[PDB]
mmCIF file of N, CA and C in Angstrom:
data_model
loop_
_atom_site.group_PDB
_atom_site.id
_atom_site.type_symbol
_atom_site.label_atom_id
_atom_site.label_comp_id
_atom_site.label_asym_id
_atom_site.label_seq_id
_atom_site.Cartn_x
_atom_site.Cartn_y
_atom_site.Cartn_z
ATOM 1 N N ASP I 245 -116.854 36.770 -81.763
ATOM 2 C CA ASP I 245 -115.404 36.860 -81.746
ATOM 3 C C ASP I 245 -114.986 38.318 -81.947
ATOM 4 N N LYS I 246 -114.865 39.024 -80.833
ATOM 5 C CA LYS I 246 -114.474 40.424 -80.872
ATOM 6 C C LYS I 246 -112.948 40.523 -80.839
ATOM 7 N N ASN I 247 -112.325 39.919 -81.841
ATOM 8 C CA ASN I 247 -110.876 39.932 -81.937
ATOM 9 C C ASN I 247 -110.451 39.270 -83.249
ATOM 10 N N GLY I 248 -111.156 38.202 -83.591
ATOM 11 C CA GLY I 248 -110.864 37.472 -84.812
ATOM 12 C C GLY I 248 -110.079 36.193 -84.512
ATOM 13 N N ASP I 249 -110.179 35.755 -83.264
ATOM 14 C CA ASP I 249 -109.487 34.550 -82.837
ATOM 15 C C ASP I 249 -110.473 33.382 -82.817
ATOM 16 N N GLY I 250 -111.606 33.594 -83.468
ATOM 17 C CA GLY I 250 -112.636 32.570 -83.534
ATOM 18 C C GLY I 250 -113.412 32.489 -82.218
ATOM 19 N N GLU I 251 -112.662 32.388 -81.131
ATOM 20 C CA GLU I 251 -113.264 32.301 -79.811
ATOM 21 C C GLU I 251 -114.398 33.320 -79.678
ATOM 22 N N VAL I 252 -115.265 33.067 -78.708
ATOM 23 C CA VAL I 252 -116.394 33.950 -78.466
ATOM 24 C C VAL I 252 -115.915 35.184 -77.700
ATOM 25 N N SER I 253 -114.928 35.853 -78.277
ATOM 26 C CA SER I 253 -114.372 37.046 -77.662
ATOM 27 C C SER I 253 -115.453 38.122 -77.537
ATOM 28 N N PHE I 254 -116.317 37.934 -76.550
ATOM 29 C CA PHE I 254 -117.397 38.876 -76.312
ATOM 30 C C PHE I 254 -118.310 38.984 -77.534
ATOM 31 N N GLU I 255 -118.135 38.040 -78.448
ATOM 32 C CA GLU I 255 -118.933 38.017 -79.663
ATOM 33 C C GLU I 255 -119.019 36.592 -80.213
ATOM 34 N N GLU I 256 -119.589 36.485 -81.406
ATOM 35 C CA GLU I 256 -119.739 35.192 -82.051
ATOM 36 C C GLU I 256 -120.759 35.282 -83.188
#
């Protein structure tokens, strides 16, 4: 989550 929205925003 490269944003902090939980979603796998290019991360996780």
